[PDB]
Amino acid sequence: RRPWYIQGAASPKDMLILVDVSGSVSGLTLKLIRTSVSEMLETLSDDDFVNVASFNSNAQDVSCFQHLVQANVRNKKVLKDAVNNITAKGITDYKK
């Protein structure tokens, strides 16, 4: 997980974490999804770009960004603080 390893082990990325906030993920699945998205963001460096969508019968962004941002310490902090507020309710629609 170290910066030097994750740097020398691949090329810069354009990640788009697509959380599922349907009703069925409510309970323990939602908690594990929050912790997982955070621990996944912690594997991004400053050359990689990231954004966290979220879909439940409607696909919306999870934060104030609406496009791929640079994944530095401040942007990752924004994304984590916005993911920790996710709630689960609705139907699922993978096409949206």
Partner 1 sequence: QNPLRKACISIVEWKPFETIILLTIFANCVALAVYLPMPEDDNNSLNLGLEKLEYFFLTVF
Give the residues lining the site for partner 1 (CB under 8 A).
22-24, 26-27, 88-92
In this structure, the strands spanning 49-55 and 59-61 are antiparallel
For the chain, the maximum distance between any two Cα atoms, rounded to a whole number of angstroms, is 41
Distance of CA 80 to the CA centre of its chain: 8
Establish whether 24 is an annotated binding residue: yes
Is 45 annotated to bind a ligand? Reply is no
Nearest residue (CB) to partner 1, 11 versus 87 = 87
Write down the least CB distance from residue 91 to partner 1, Å.
Answer: 6
Considering beta carbons, is residue 24 or 35 the nearer one to partner 1?
Answer: 24
> How big, in percent rounded to 5, are the helix, strand and coil portions of the chain?
30, 20, 50
- Residues within the annotated binding site? 20, 22, 24
